[PDB]
Scaffold this active site. Structure first.
Site, PDB file in Angstrom:
ATOM      1  N   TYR A 118      -6.155  -6.810 -28.388  1.00  0.00           N
ATOM      2  CA  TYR A 118      -4.968  -6.964 -27.567  1.00  0.00           C
ATOM      3  C   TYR A 118      -4.183  -8.230 -27.968  1.00  0.00           C
ATOM      4  O   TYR A 118      -4.723  -9.342 -28.000  1.00  0.00           O
ATOM      5  CB  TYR A 118      -5.336  -6.942 -26.078  1.00  0.00           C
ATOM      6  N   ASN A 136     -14.565   5.246 -24.994  1.00  0.00           N
ATOM      7  CA  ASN A 136     -14.169   6.417 -25.783  1.00  0.00           C
ATOM      8  C   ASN A 136     -15.389   7.154 -26.374  1.00  0.00           C
ATOM      9  O   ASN A 136     -15.336   7.669 -27.496  1.00  0.00           O
ATOM     10  CB  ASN A 136     -13.120   6.061 -26.876  1.00  0.00           C
ATOM     11  N   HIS A 167       4.504  -3.841  -8.825  1.00  0.00           N
ATOM     12  CA  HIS A 167       3.504  -2.832  -9.167  1.00  0.00           C
ATOM     13  C   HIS A 167       2.092  -3.291  -8.880  1.00  0.00           C
ATOM     14  O   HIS A 167       1.312  -2.499  -8.376  1.00  0.00           O
ATOM     15  CB  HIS A 167       3.665  -2.404 -10.595  1.00  0.00           C
ATOM     16  N   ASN A 188       0.112  -1.014  -6.313  1.00  0.00           N
ATOM     17  CA  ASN A 188      -1.149  -0.417  -6.743  1.00  0.00           C
ATOM     18  C   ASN A 188      -2.339  -0.898  -5.899  1.00  0.00           C
ATOM     19  O   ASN A 188      -3.249  -0.126  -5.649  1.00  0.00           O
ATOM     20  CB  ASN A 188      -1.382  -0.641  -8.242  1.00  0.00           C
ATOM     21  N   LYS A 197      -2.388  -0.817 -15.844  1.00  0.00           N
ATOM     22  CA  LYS A 197      -1.662  -1.995 -16.290  1.00  0.00           C
ATOM     23  C   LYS A 197      -0.387  -2.156 -15.463  1.00  0.00           C
ATOM     24  O   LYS A 197       0.419  -1.242 -15.417  1.00  0.00           O
ATOM     25  CB  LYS A 197      -1.280  -1.878 -17.766  1.00  0.00           C
ATOM     26  N   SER A 204      -5.631   4.360 -18.842  1.00  0.00           N
ATOM     27  CA  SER A 204      -4.354   5.053 -18.620  1.00  0.00           C
ATOM     28  C   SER A 204      -4.348   5.913 -17.342  1.00  0.00           C
ATOM     29  O   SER A 204      -4.026   7.092 -17.399  1.00  0.00           O
ATOM     30  CB  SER A 204      -3.969   5.885 -19.849  1.00  0.00           C
ATOM     31  N   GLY A 230       2.516  -5.081 -15.322  1.00  0.00           N
ATOM     32  CA  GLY A 230       3.211  -6.301 -15.670  1.00  0.00           C
ATOM     33  C   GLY A 230       4.233  -6.846 -14.684  1.00  0.00           C
ATOM     34  O   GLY A 230       4.916  -7.805 -15.002  1.00  0.00           O
TER      35      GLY A 230
HETATM   36  N1  LIG Z   1      -9.253   2.463 -25.720  1.00  0.00           N
HETATM   37  C1  LIG Z   1      -9.313   1.939 -24.525  1.00  0.00           C
HETATM   38  O1  LIG Z   1     -10.429   1.596 -24.012  1.00  0.00           O
HETATM   39  C2  LIG Z   1      -8.013   1.803 -23.783  1.00  0.00           C
HETATM   40  C3  LIG Z   1      -6.852   2.543 -24.107  1.00  0.00           C
HETATM   41  C4  LIG Z   1      -5.713   2.395 -23.365  1.00  0.00           C
HETATM   42  C5  LIG Z   1      -5.716   1.487 -22.307  1.00  0.00           C
HETATM   43  N2  LIG Z   1      -6.830   0.753 -22.019  1.00  0.00           N
HETATM   44  C6  LIG Z   1      -6.843  -0.198 -20.882  1.00  0.00           C
HETATM   45  O2  LIG Z   1      -6.312   0.479 -19.738  1.00  0.00           O
HETATM   46  C7  LIG Z   1      -5.127  -0.226 -19.307  1.00  0.00           C
HETATM   47  C8  LIG Z   1      -4.150   0.722 -18.620  1.00  0.00           C
HETATM   48  O3  LIG Z   1      -3.786   1.763 -19.483  1.00  0.00           O
HETATM   49  P1  LIG Z   1      -2.289   1.921 -19.922  1.00  0.00           P
HETATM   50  O4  LIG Z   1      -1.578   0.606 -19.937  1.00  0.00           O
HETATM   51  O5  LIG Z   1      -2.469   2.685 -21.205  1.00  0.00           O
HETATM   52  O6  LIG Z   1      -1.550   2.899 -18.886  1.00  0.00           O
HETATM   53  P2  LIG Z   1      -1.339   2.959 -17.267  1.00  0.00           P
HETATM   54  O7  LIG Z   1      -1.934   1.809 -16.494  1.00  0.00           O
HETATM   55  O8  LIG Z   1      -1.545   4.404 -16.939  1.00  0.00           O
HETATM   56  O9  LIG Z   1       0.252   2.778 -17.227  1.00  0.00           O
HETATM   57  C9  LIG Z   1       0.882   1.559 -17.548  1.00  0.00           C
HETATM   58  C10 LIG Z   1       2.358   1.736 -17.256  1.00  0.00           C
HETATM   59  O10 LIG Z   1       2.577   2.113 -15.884  1.00  0.00           O
HETATM   60  C11 LIG Z   1       3.533   1.223 -15.285  1.00  0.00           C
HETATM   61  N3  LIG Z   1       3.172   1.072 -13.863  1.00  0.00           N
HETATM   62  C12 LIG Z   1       2.055   0.547 -13.334  1.00  0.00           C
HETATM   63  N4  LIG Z   1       2.057   0.631 -11.994  1.00  0.00           N
HETATM   64  C13 LIG Z   1       3.205   1.248 -11.652  1.00  0.00           C
HETATM   65  C14 LIG Z   1       3.849   1.691 -10.386  1.00  0.00           C
HETATM   66  N5  LIG Z   1       3.240   1.444  -9.217  1.00  0.00           N
HETATM   67  N6  LIG Z   1       5.062   2.289 -10.456  1.00  0.00           N
HETATM   68  C15 LIG Z   1       5.663   2.538 -11.635  1.00  0.00           C
HETATM   69  N7  LIG Z   1       5.129   2.174 -12.815  1.00  0.00           N
HETATM   70  C16 LIG Z   1       3.931   1.540 -12.883  1.00  0.00           C
HETATM   71  C17 LIG Z   1       3.508  -0.057 -16.096  1.00  0.00           C
HETATM   72  O11 LIG Z   1       4.779  -0.682 -15.923  1.00  0.00           O
HETATM   73  P3  LIG Z   1       4.902  -2.273 -15.614  1.00  0.00           P
HETATM   74  O12 LIG Z   1       3.969  -2.938 -16.623  1.00  0.00           O
HETATM   75  O13 LIG Z   1       6.390  -2.595 -15.729  1.00  0.00           O
HETATM   76  O14 LIG Z   1       4.361  -2.390 -14.212  1.00  0.00           O
HETATM   77  C18 LIG Z   1       3.155   0.471 -17.492  1.00  0.00           C
HETATM   78  O15 LIG Z   1       4.343   0.859 -18.149  1.00  0.00           O
HETATM   79  C19 LIG Z   1      -4.608  -1.023 -20.502  1.00  0.00           C
HETATM   80  O16 LIG Z   1      -3.836  -2.166 -20.120  1.00  0.00           O
HETATM   81  C20 LIG Z   1      -5.937  -1.410 -21.114  1.00  0.00           C
HETATM   82  O17 LIG Z   1      -6.469  -2.530 -20.389  1.00  0.00           O
HETATM   83  C21 LIG Z   1      -7.952   0.914 -22.730  1.00  0.00           C
END
Ligand SMILES: NC(=O)c1ccc[n+]([C@@H]2O[C@H](COP(=O)([O-])OP(=O)(O)OC[C@H]3O[C@@H](n4cnc5c(N)ncnc54)[C@H](OP(=O)(O)O)[C@@H]3O)[C@@H](O)[C@H]2O)c1
Length: 274
Positions: free
Chosen positions: A58, A148, A250, A254, A244, A199, A246
């Site tokens: 990251y 994964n 949110h 959340n 996630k 995600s 930022g």
């Molecule tokens: N391989 C792996 O193990 C792997 C892969 C992917 C992710 N991850 C981990 O999982 C985390 C989360 O996954 P992700 O970032 O892929 O997707 P996620 O949390 O499903 O979605 C993130 C997105 O949703 C938005 N968001 C969050 N809360 C919201 C709300 N209440 N209303 C509207 N929009 C909202 C964020 O916008 P804002 O930021 O503007 O709030 C961001 O654009 C990552 O940060 C990482 O730590 C791990």
């Protein structure tokens, strides 16, 4: 904040973790909002986001640096910090170097949870897991887990590991349901492994059909659709989620999702969407 037991550790962790992908850059370091991001992280921690999900990958390491600064305003032992080793570093000496540099960048003596980020079929699991066990023996890692890994590989990991595998972090949300098709979620639930849903908002990319049923349920609870998709995950045994966020808005929104009580019929309707 909802708490759930991690694996069979007798230790509870925040059931919403703080996703950090994109904080301080993506594949490469981004130094351009550093003070703003350190302040964001402090505010999240203060709100109760004490479980933090990060990785060496990251921001090319920079995410861990920012987290490292942010955690200085808090007692280290109150925080649950998760990092990860990238599949290029699963050989023993490479894993221990990655661990060490993760710790340097976080400026801390240990991580709470350390994960294989992705499996690498060319590197024997037994080697990787034994190197991680060295980390645990040395006091550098409290718990180990994987990411994964499908059911078969999780089984294989469990057989080849001296240390318990406390979690499998995988993609899981209202549309993405590979952990159900694989028997992985059931496996985790029967064998004391925590499934960690990454995600969990599907990055807000959702079909029309799923939005329609999410809207109905959201309005019945006077919540947003995103709150419903987090509550749906949190309602399942052994499931923790790592959205996630930022933005403060949110982060706050959340957090509210931990006190939504979905009915049995709402759970069934939501389950039917994937
Ligand atoms: N391989 C792996 O193990 C792997 C892969 C992917 C992710 N991850 C981990 O999982 C985390 C989360 O996954 P992700 O970032 O892929 O997707 P996620 O949390 O499903 O979605 C993130 C997105 O949703 C938005 N968001 C969050 N809360 C919201 C709300 N209440 N209303 C509207 N929009 C909202 C964020 O916008 P804002 O930021 O503007 O709030 C961001 O654009 C990552 O940060 C990482 O730590 C791990």
């Amino acid at each position: 904040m909802l708490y759930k037991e991690l694996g069979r550790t007798g230790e509870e962790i925040p059931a919403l973790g703080l996703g950090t992908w994109g904080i301080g850059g993506f594949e490469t370091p981004d130094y351009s909002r550093d003070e703003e991001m350190v302040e964001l992280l402090k505010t999240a921690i203060k709100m109760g986001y004490t479980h933090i999900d990060t990785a060496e990958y990251y921001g090319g390491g920079h995410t861990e640096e920012l987290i490292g600064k942010a955690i200085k305003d808090f007692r280290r032992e109150d925080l649950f910090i998760v990092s990860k080793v990238w599949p290029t570093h699963l050989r023993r000496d490479d894993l221990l170097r990655s661990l060490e540099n993760t710790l340097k960048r976080l400026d801390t003596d240990y991580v709470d949870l350390y994960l294989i980020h992705w499996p690498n079929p060319e590197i024997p699991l037994e080697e990787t897991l034994s190197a991680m066990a060295e980390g645990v023996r040395q006091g550098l890692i409290r718990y180990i887990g994987v990411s994964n890994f499908d059911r078969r590989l999780l089984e294989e990991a469990i057989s080849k590991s001296q240390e318990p595998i406390v979690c499998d972090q995988v993609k899981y949300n209202i549309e993405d349901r590979d952990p159900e098709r694989d028997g992985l979620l059931e496996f985790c639930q029967k064998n004391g492994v925590t499934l960690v849903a990454y995600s969990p908002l599907r990055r807000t990319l959702l079909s029309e059909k799923t939005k329609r049923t999410l809207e109905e349920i959201a309005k019945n609870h006077g919540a947003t659709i995103y709150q419903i998709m987090l509550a749906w995950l949190l309602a399942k045994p052994n499931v923790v989620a790592i959205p996630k966020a930022g933005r403060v808005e949110h982060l706050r929104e959340n957090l509210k999702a931990t006190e939504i009580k979905l009915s049995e019929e709402e759970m069934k309707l939501l389950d039917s969407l994937g």
